[PDB]
Amino acid sequence: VTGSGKKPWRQKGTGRARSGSIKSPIWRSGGVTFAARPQDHSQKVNKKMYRGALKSILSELVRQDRLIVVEKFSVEAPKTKLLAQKLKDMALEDVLIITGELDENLFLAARNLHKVDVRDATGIDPVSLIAFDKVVMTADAVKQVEEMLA
Amino acid sequence: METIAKHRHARSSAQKVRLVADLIRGKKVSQALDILTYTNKKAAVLVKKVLESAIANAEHNDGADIDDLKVTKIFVDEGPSMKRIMPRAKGRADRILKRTSHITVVVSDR
């Protein structure tokens, strides 16, 4: 806190309490004791155990039976009005879809749909993997999982 | 048959107004003027004014006639006491408290 770095009144003499500055953090408009600097709260996990997490939670997902796999989940037009009609006969409400190649159409049709996110197959994640009701997968994209967990 | 009448932000104290407004509790308004017209404090003109305005508002708006009224409730508050600065010696100063009172007068027959 800027400004006055002078003694506001002297030490002895005047019977008020002893004080050093208006910047003293027990006053109005002073500083504070221990406010932070900018920081980074991100820790470090290890690679073996981070892959062990995805080794474990998918096992528990199948044991919960919250996993569907299809040959190719696709709608062949960049238009949400058919994705939100295919899913209502797929009997789903909030699912993740993963795909092998970087498809444009499924991503575009699911971007507006706030529940139904479509990730890729590489950049999957534990928290949005666990945070849904059902998860569907792709006959090609699951083989990258097969290779990268083993 | 209650009738309020009030008077707010007046130059009186908070402990001189009661010294005249402890005379008008339970009297016919005839006597409540025959006392207020000759008690000789400052607030004896203010409480006289507000009692007159009360008696008139009962004359107007709630059916009441002048000599019917009996002063049931009267009590005075501590208003917004604004303040000044007057010098005492050696540079010392003072928030001198110019007090004031929210005078209320409630008249009725019941």
């Binding site: 009144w9 002895k12 003499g13 005047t14 019977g15 | 604004m82 303040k83 000044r84 600065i85 050696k90 540079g91 010392r92 100063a93 003072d94 928030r95």
Partner: peptide, 22 residues
Amino acid sequence: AAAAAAAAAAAAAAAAAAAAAA
């Protein structure tokens, strides 16, 4: 209207060297 709130006179340390105890 309104008004201020004065304070903090040069209070002369409230004493001389009065209590000459020696």
